Write a protein that binds this ligand. Structure first.
Ligand SMILES: [Mg+2]
Ligand SMILES: [Zn+2]
Ligand SMILES: [Zn+2]
Ligand SMILES: [Zn+2]
Ligand SMILES: [Zn+2]
Lengths: 130, 103, 100, 56, 93, 55
RNA sequence: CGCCGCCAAGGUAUGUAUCAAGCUUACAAGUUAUGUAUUUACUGACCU
RNA sequence: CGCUUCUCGGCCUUUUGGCUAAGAUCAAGUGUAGUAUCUGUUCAUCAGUUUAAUAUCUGA
């Protein structure tokens, strides 16, 4: 409700700090912060916070890779699709276990959150799911 | 605690092989639990390649039996003298040969 | 829930008793444990909604704030038209944490 | 450390020994001097005192 | 104030991160350490897969991290069981 | 006077790189200078060059 | 018998490619596998 | 044909220089449910039990 009172640089420098805002054990912080990521990306576009949420996928710790998986789902569902899906397909080529599990669980929460809007994207992620 | 498992011991061997000898914070910066002093303690205790951690002999035992009688304590003093140099293997040899002399 | 497999549901016949959720578990589904797409109100039996058990959350058993819901994924799989999904037992979770 | 390196010619190693001995003489003669100066109260420098701690 | 003998720092630094980026860089540094030690030791059977885990090829065994592989040089000695493959390669010693 | 987190048992376990760990705290040295303000800033001992700030 | 009267450098970085005034001459000019001691990792939006 | 010397190339340490007080200092996490993978480790002939078929027991 107030995304016009900045210099457009602050929402980009707090989303890195919102990564360290995770691993808090209440489940209310961790369910509100993904909505904050979604409205940040609604404000300043889903192309710069996206690389931050994909760099949050090599942590070795849980409650920090699934809590950015949900953030990938919220940047997928708040603003329109086809802005997060090519890079989410691209990160599977990175030879690491955690980033591949993160992009698969982000596809899970993606289709879970979109429902009926997955009629056009099944043929695109079927070669990834195979 | 300092359990010092072998997966960290071989990493410490590779870190001593790459970096150096008096270079300890830079190699303890990659172990997630240990500081420099405990790594120094184990490397001068177990991981130095001049340590003869096995092959107990006859001459060093008869050397230390009238050397642990010169001084009853001070096993780390006589540890460069014997050449066993681990400073705890001498204690094991001492209590083992005193258990064998009592039985 | 699906997170802790040792929890069992009540599975008796559902009446007109509208289920409730606490402020800690608001928006949570009962079966799939999700947050989106609410479709069906939760109906529980009269034994699990009686006396001091009224206005009570389904999962944690705390004081209810909002109404409980089913998801559309539970609706089209028809996991809402089964028995009453009131969690009765509480084991190895929120019990040993009280002793620690 | 006694610095016994093998396979080395004698004139360069003993000229290194007398050069580090001359540096040691300058080092200890400056250590005595600034220790006496911070004893009687000449300088109040943190650099000189925190250096003279390790230089004693 | 003593501006010359204080613990100083440079402006615009940003500081140092939390535990996550620190042990991420620690695991990448231990990965580079393991790769350079097998580069010096010249091991042709060490292989990394498509998910960031290690494999002994004659062993056909997995290793979750670096020290899991570089402690597997003493046990289940198939490296001496390649003497049969060398005898198949050359009938004489 | 000051009571809020003076001992500060575990602050919040941050990193404390160089200066915020070992350096001195500037806020007591500025609140004490704020506390004696008319008699560290009095107008009539040296009545010459005065330097007013912006606004 | 009556000391003493304080400025600054030390901190908010500096290396670049364009665009006027400041200053300057106003000039020269057709081997699979088991059991266990035992770690390392991974999962469940696990949890005050 | 052999031998000594010189020059050119195919090359097997090259790290950002040196010195001061190793230049000085630093680096906390759980508890629950479950799984994968290393190290260590060890693998004489009828009848029935069991098992998809196999692999424990009693028998001479
Ligand atoms: Mg500086
Ligand atoms: Zn609840
Ligand atoms: Zn559901
Ligand atoms: Zn019920
Ligand atoms: Zn028996």
């Amino acid at each position: 409700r107030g995304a016009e009172y900045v210099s457009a640089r602050e929402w980009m420098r707090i989303c890195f700090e919102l990564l360290e805002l995770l691993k808090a054990h209440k489940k209310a912080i961790r369910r509100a912060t993904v909505n904050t990521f979604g409205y940040i990306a609604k404000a300043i576009g889903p192309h710069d916070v996206l690389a931050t949420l994909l760099n949050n996928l090599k942590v070795q710790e849980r409650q920090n890779r699934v809590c950015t998986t949900v953030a990938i789902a919220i940047v997928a569902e708040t603003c329109s699709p086809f802005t997060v899906l090519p890079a989410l397909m691209n990160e599977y080529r990175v030879p690491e276990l955690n980033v591949q599990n993160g992009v698969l669980k982000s596809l899970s929460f993606l289709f879970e959150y979109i429902g009926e809007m997955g009629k056009d994207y099944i043929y695109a992620v079927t070669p990834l799911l195979e | 605690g300092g359990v010092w498992r072998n997966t960290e011991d071989e990493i410490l061997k590779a870190a001593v092989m790459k970096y150096g000898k008096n270079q300890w914070s830079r190699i303890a910066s990659l172990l997630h639990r240990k500081s420099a002093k405990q790594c120094k303690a184990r490397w001068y205790e177990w991981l130095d390649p001049s340590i003869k951690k096995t092959e107990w002999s006859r001459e060093e035992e008869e050397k230390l039996l009238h050397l642990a009688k010169l001084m009853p304590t001070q096993w780390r003093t006589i540890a460069p003298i014997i050449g066993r140099t681990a400073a705890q293997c001498l204690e094991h040899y001492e209590f083992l040969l005193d258990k064998a002399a009592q039985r | 829930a699906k997170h802790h497999p040792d929890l069992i549901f009540c599975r008796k016949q559902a009446g007109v008793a509208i289920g409730r959720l606490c402020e800690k578990c608001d928006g949570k589904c009962v079966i799939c444990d999700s947050y989106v797409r609410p479709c069906t109100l939760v109906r529980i039996c009269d034994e699990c909604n009686y006396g001091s058990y009224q206005g009570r959350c389904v999962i944690c058993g705390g004081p209810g704030v909002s109404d409980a819901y089913y998801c559309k994924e539970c609706t089209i799989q028809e996991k809402d038209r089964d028995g009453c999904p009131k969690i009765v037992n509480l084991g190895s979770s929120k019990t040993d944490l009280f002793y620690e | 450390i006694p610095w016994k390196v093998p396979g080395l010619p004698t004139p360069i190693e003993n000229m290194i020994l007398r050069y580090v001995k001359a540096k040691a003489d300058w080092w200890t003669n400056t250590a005595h001097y600034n220790r006496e100066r911070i004893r009687r109260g000449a300088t109040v420098d943190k650099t000189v005192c925190k250096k003279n701690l390790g230089r004693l | 104030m003593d501006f010359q003998h204080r613990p100083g720092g440079k402006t615009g630094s940003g500081g140092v991160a939390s535990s996550s980026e620190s042990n991420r860089d620690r695991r990448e540094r231990l990965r580079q350490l393991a790769l350079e030690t097998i580069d010096i030791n010249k091991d042709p059977y060490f292989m990394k897969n498509h998910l960031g885990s290690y494999e002994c090829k004659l062993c056909l065994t997995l290793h979750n991290n670096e020290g899991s592989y570089l402690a597997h040089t003493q046990g289940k000695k198939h490296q001496t069981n390649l003497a049969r493959r060398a005898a198949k390669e050359a009938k004489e010693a | 006077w000051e009571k809020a987190s003076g001992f500060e048992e575990s602050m919040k376990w941050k990193k404390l790189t160089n200066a915020q760990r070992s350096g001195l705290n500037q806020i007591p040295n500025r609140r004490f200078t704020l506390w004696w303000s008319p008699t560290i800033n009095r107008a009539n001992v040296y009545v010459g060059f005065q330097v007013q700030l912006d606004l």
